[PDB]
Assembly symmetry: D2
Homo-oligomer: 256 residues x 4
């Protein structure tokens, strides 16, 4: 009952972190709209979870997003929280292997889709004194190798979260982000499968955390439910869900 009577939209909620967030909010008592560009996972999740429904929506298509918001209000009568989770990490790319156009396309998903849904949702979030939760990444803060466009998009999301928090504070609408580190998801598994030694790639990812394991979608979901339901004095924060990967010295490569 922590978030009972509330209505939540989760983008990219059909699998991975997004599905973990969907499950966490349903378990808290909320009704959840699962937005995803792929039907497979999200439609099955709707059948599985009574408090969840699936709406096909590509967050890069402004008309898809307009319909997502108007259908949410038409079907459920209010909107309390938007979780902007949809996003993609390309395979490793050296800087000279990137393109401006590929950079533009990744900005369209990771940044502008978050911007567009947030903009269309804010009039309703103001009425409900709701909140926005953006899923950024630890690598926006500390960088990552072979990922210049991806890192840039998440640096933008984290910064945008703080700007929006300032703008919406007089209306009682909080805007926060979660920065996960290595979370074991289908995207992580897909990316490891492209590596010469997938098992070695996965073990390296596990040992990047002092805790010695990757995180779970359910753990990101619990952080999201906290930010929505119990963090009434938090706005503009970056909640790290990383297992301590940012702590201490590690292998990143006597004084010349």
């Amino acid at each position: 009952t922590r978030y009972a009577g509330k209505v939540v939209v989760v983008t990219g909620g059909g699998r991975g972190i997004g599905a973990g967030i969907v499950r966490a909010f349903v378990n808290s008592g909320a009704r959840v709209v699962i937005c995803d560009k792929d039907e497979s996972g999200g439609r099955a999740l709707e059948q599985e979870l009574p408090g969840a429904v699936f709406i096909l929506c590509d967050v890069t298509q402004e008309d898809d997003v307009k319909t997502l918001v108007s259908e949410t209000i038409r079907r459920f009568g209010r909107l309390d929280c938007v979780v902007n989770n949809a996003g993609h990490h390309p395979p490793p790319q050296r800087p000279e292997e990137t393109s401006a156009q590929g950079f533009r396309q990744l900005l369209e998903l990771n940044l502008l889709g978050t911007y567009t849904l947030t903009k269309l949702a804010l009039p309703y979030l103001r009425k409900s004194q709701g909140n926005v939760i953006n899923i950024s990444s630890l690598v926006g803060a500390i960088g990552q190798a072979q990922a210049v466009p991806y890192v840039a998009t998440k640096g933008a999301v984290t910064a945008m979260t703080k700007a929006l928090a300032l703008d919406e504070s007089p209306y009682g609408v909080r805007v926060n982000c979660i920065s996960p580190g290595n979370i074991w998801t289908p995207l992580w598994e897909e990316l490891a499968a492209l590596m010469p030694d997938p098992r070695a790639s996965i073990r390296e990812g596990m040992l990047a955390q002092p805790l010695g394991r990757m995180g779970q979608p359910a753990e990101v979901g619990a952080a999201a439910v906290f930010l929505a339901s119990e963090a009434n004095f938090c706005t503009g924060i970056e909640l790290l869900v990383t297992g301590g990967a940012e702590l201490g010295y590690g292998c990143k490569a006597p004084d010349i």
Copy 2:
């Protein structure tokens, strides 16, 4: 039931933020040991809350703290979480008005008391795969005027939290801190009463946050219960509970 069956020690739990944390953990189903050097508030809290008991303990006295831990284990059989909240903010002091000995005394409360309880508790936290929550302050991160010793003690607590998180990660013990901003507590009220215009001092403190109000002990308490019960992939983090005070430009004082 979020933290049912667990045993929590809260230092400085007799009033203010500490009492808000005590209440939050009792509401989550935990048994709570209220530690405080003053009997008045903590003893009344024990009478009020069934899941809470009061143990008189000055965290600067190592033998008081040894007895706090051994009495907790004797009476409740386990220890799952230590919340190091005891601490003090002196009245405003210009740098030339501080002393090394006053600095040493503030380090004894704000830093070494946290260190001592954590050290004595860790053998039991390892057995329970428990966790440590230190109450630091936003001003450890961003500074504050007329508070050189206080700011230094909280910078130490936040850093120490990260070091300890690294050391205890192989044992499954998480170590995190909460950095509150302006929280309306008896200490805040006492400090404002020393000012020429207390009402103006309080209004200034309220407007230091984009949210336009100070925070509540219950809001710090909810963050603590989150870190203890649902943040299993968080260690070494600094959870800001500040109402956005660190965001954007403000009045802190054309190019010469």
Copy 3:
């Protein structure tokens, strides 16, 4: 002679911070290519400074940038440092007053122009073991009101700086950024002139810093010359040139 024999490109170098950086590098002994989309300031700077030449170049036009790099190599035989300073801050815009297309256009200047020049310059910077300096902004780190797109672009630049630093570290090429706060420039003056009370707007900007004044282009220039010439163990850093604006509590707007 701190940077004698070296060749530096400064984008947006015709006025403001960029011109201050141009002057600082000329004073250090470097030859400087002034890139700007406007002829007026940059052409006069070339006439004024013996070690500087002006090349008309719009950093959003990839063919302009290709020609900028090839002309620099043709005329001076090497390239040691690229300072990505070109960028724009729109007038204050409430979130609901922004557009995706306006956001895209600002990303094109503030982020992708920096990306494009850096990409085209890196083969030559590798040969010279040169370095990249991006001019970001403090508001990428802490947020700003009525500037969601601008803040997002600078969050991206700061993050991208760290990603690129990781990628180029094995080649000995350092990548750093400077985050200025309020610097008194023609852009600042233009923006204040749009306000109801320009003088009040300027005084507010001055008092946003504990130092009680805004910064100078020459001060950003000195930081850039430091990063280029004497910071051989710095890569991926964010050098704050802000007068302390990020420090302490301020006016950003008792516990409800």
Copy 4:
């Protein structure tokens, strides 16, 4: 001539980073007072460098420090910059192997010695509009394993730098810190010699940086001369001299 006519005190200046800072300031044209508790290195440095003199001074002894300041003024007539570099890193210590009294002793050197010299110097720095530079450490910011007391002392120094910057800003006195990462110094070499495999310990320290090497005292010295002589709009900053050790993922230890 960048800092000609100025007078600088460097504590712990007899070897290591401190000696590199002494050399950098002498090369900039300043007169330097070398403070150290050991005579060997500092006395030889005075003989070697015309613009430098050695004063025996233990920064934990308040009367030593009073005499250091009064002798500096008596001999040179002004004081422009204090570099608080004296400090120590103990050998690796597990948390349960530390003591409160050992923690107190390390606070006395790393934190209170910096506090005491700064306090005694500030009246003269106000007259000269001088500045303070504290040598902290990257591990104050990100933590380190087996170093709870050391990490806590450097977290305190970095925070104290920001508090003091706020307090002294109305007097035109800037207060900044440098946070080095792995710098190859006699302390680093001594600590590695205690390890089972010193060569393996040194190689691990080198590879903790994306640049693949440790830093040099001269590189910390150049950062200090920058902060003193050319960073007039920087106060309360933490200048990282770390070779990028804080960037990206590394080895710090699939989802359980």
